[model samples]
Target: HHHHKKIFKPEELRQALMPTLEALYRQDPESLPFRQPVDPQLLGIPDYFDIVKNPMDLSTIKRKLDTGQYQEPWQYVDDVWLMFNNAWLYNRKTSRVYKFCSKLAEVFEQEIDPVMQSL
Candidate 1:
């Protein structure tokens, strides 16, 4: 009795994903390789992505993949890194993508505070 029906709503998905983000945050504070303060005002979500995407140099990084030198961008970074390698996995049909993104952002915000406090 397998139905092709969806079970989780957008809010439900967000609720489920938030804890994973928090756990990830606790496990890795220096997730980003560069030197920056881990605070909302300093290393915001957009700023975090910019740091990840910048060193990654998406255009040049793609060339490595095309050459079979690497399997994925995350491969180049440490296994402990918190890069959003799975972000593109969500397609237009996924109703929870926005909610998921927002929840993930919250996790980032929450985790960053501790590291800043430690400094």
Candidate 2:
């Protein structure tokens, strides 16, 4: 089995960063969605995937990492749920929610929910 210091709780991360994110977005419209330079150091995991490089997509990851939260299996579940909720609420009238739900459901079926079920 693998070992680590600790993983973060989703609610804790949300409570920690939501205010800062909101303030940042309100303070500087352009700063709300900021990007960072891509470096392997930042992407410590060799298997870490980057769809785009140079100014690595920080819009989502930044807020998560900035919360000083460690990742765990539950974190993955929270991430999927959060993204799905965002997509659902933001684009409620569009097919986006359906798409998000479908993807999230698949992830749950294949990984998360199964783990939870086993436990």
Candidate 3:
């Protein structure tokens, strides 16, 4: 392929998707951990990097979208899924982050999936 074709047109996709991402990260105070990349030392989970190799978060996804780095809708969805998966994977089921991930995952699937499909 020549220079990785982009079907959605970067600006168009960004405009369509950025609103939901903004809402998602700013949904509530409880969802604070997902606003940006996690700091293992700050969160007191120093081993986080060892497990969650590709750490995805709302801000990173936003940056990617704004920077026109995504080639397709699935790329965006994959990043969001990776964000939730990282939280679930790094933390035990009993932990707060895992449950939070559950909630966010549901919201993403319900709200964002259709948008991606529509585009």
Candidate 4:
């Protein structure tokens, strides 16, 4: 009897999803159903800490995910999610956080899941 196995390549998956990620990054902040201009200083990071340095580029994020530099691939997603979530926290309303979480859920369902399946 013979068995077949599928090989997973992070680079290929990254390449395939790069455009979608970039489209999300390019989405207008005003268009999203959350607060705008997330303040890094409020998150207690150094003033120089720029998310733009990495800037949600799929290749950079996938490299970190593939290397196991973090415990989970969700960490990459969380990094971007936090920027929006934390900013909305100041208002402290139940609905805002719900919307934020809902948005992230859509990303995971619509974006991340398809990529994972391809791998």
Candidate 5:
């Protein structure tokens, strides 16, 4: 239904930005763990849900994008930020998961910050 070429609509704005962020995060295997929601039971982190105020993941973002749930561009960016911050909150600074979150956060900043700035 998004046949218009202009990027004025909320739907159009998100569609334009979605593929870039998705492709950037999926560039390597490092982001594999972040592509889905955190399974508290499966990962043996039963207290994770209690510590993190907000849970986020790439898959959730993808689902929201597909359903046109985003009303603005920053909503998507904020979710990614939440995902990284949540990881930091649940995992200790010395932990391997923290390291992964750190690296991916940089990868996101390096690639997407400029893209977001112009919008």
Candidate 6:
């Protein structure tokens, strides 16, 4: 068991998360189809490609941290999903994005949730 008060830094948590995202992409490349250009107009962000390409950018992480919405590792994990959904509009209409989110949830359940619970 670990101390309850110990909170992981954004960089530290993101480092752990990158492997899981990479694995998800490898296991099913179609899930996160970044290879094909996603319409920035759809997402209403001109730099959508950059945002998708660098999901774990330091400045973005810092801004998310500054929001004060996350107090625990699991909260951050959930926030990641929310961010993805917001960016890509994960819904029945967007099956690939939905699948990607589902796979990410599996990865977190298998690899991240236990550690978070232990802490």
How much RMSD separates candidate 6 from the native structure? 7.2
Please, what are the lDDT tens digits per residue for candidate 6 over residues 1-119? Answer: 45556666656655555554455456465444432335568768685555454343223433555555345666656655644555455245456666665665566468765555544
Q: Name the candidate, 2 or 3, with the larger TM-score value.
A: 3
Model 4 root mean square deviation, Cα atoms: 8.0
Per-model clash counts, in order, read 0, 0, 0, 0, 0, 0
RMSD of each: 18.0, 16.1, 5.0, 8.0, 5.8, 7.2
- Model 4, 34-85: lDDT tens digits are 3234345775645423334322323445455456444433455565555444
lDDT of each: 0.36, 0.43, 0.80, 0.47, 0.77, 0.52
Which candidate has the highest TM-score of all?
3
Candidate 2 lDDT over 21-63, as tens digits, reads 3433343333322333324466473432332222222356555
Q: Looking at model 1, which ten-residue stretch has the lowest summed lDDT?
A: 29-38
For all predicted structures, in order, the TM-scores are 0.26, 0.33, 0.86, 0.39, 0.80, 0.45
Runs in model 1 with CA error above 4 Å?
1-22, 25-94
Off by over 4 Å in 3: 1-6
| Structure candidate 1, residue pairs in collision | none
Clashing pairs in 4: none
For candidate 1, what is the lDDT? 0.36
- As for candidate 3, its clashing pairs are none
Candidate 3 lDDT, 1-119, residue by residue in tens? 23225477789888888877876876575478898789888879788888988888888898899899987888888888898888888888997778888887877777885576566
> Which of candidates 1 and 5 reaches a greater lDDT?
5
User: Which 10-residue span in candidate 5 carries the lowest summed lDDT?
Assistant: 1-10
* Cα misplacement distance, residue 48 of candidate 2 (Å): 29
| Deviation of model 4 at 19, angstroms | 3.2
Name the candidate, 3 or 6, with the larger lDDT value.
3
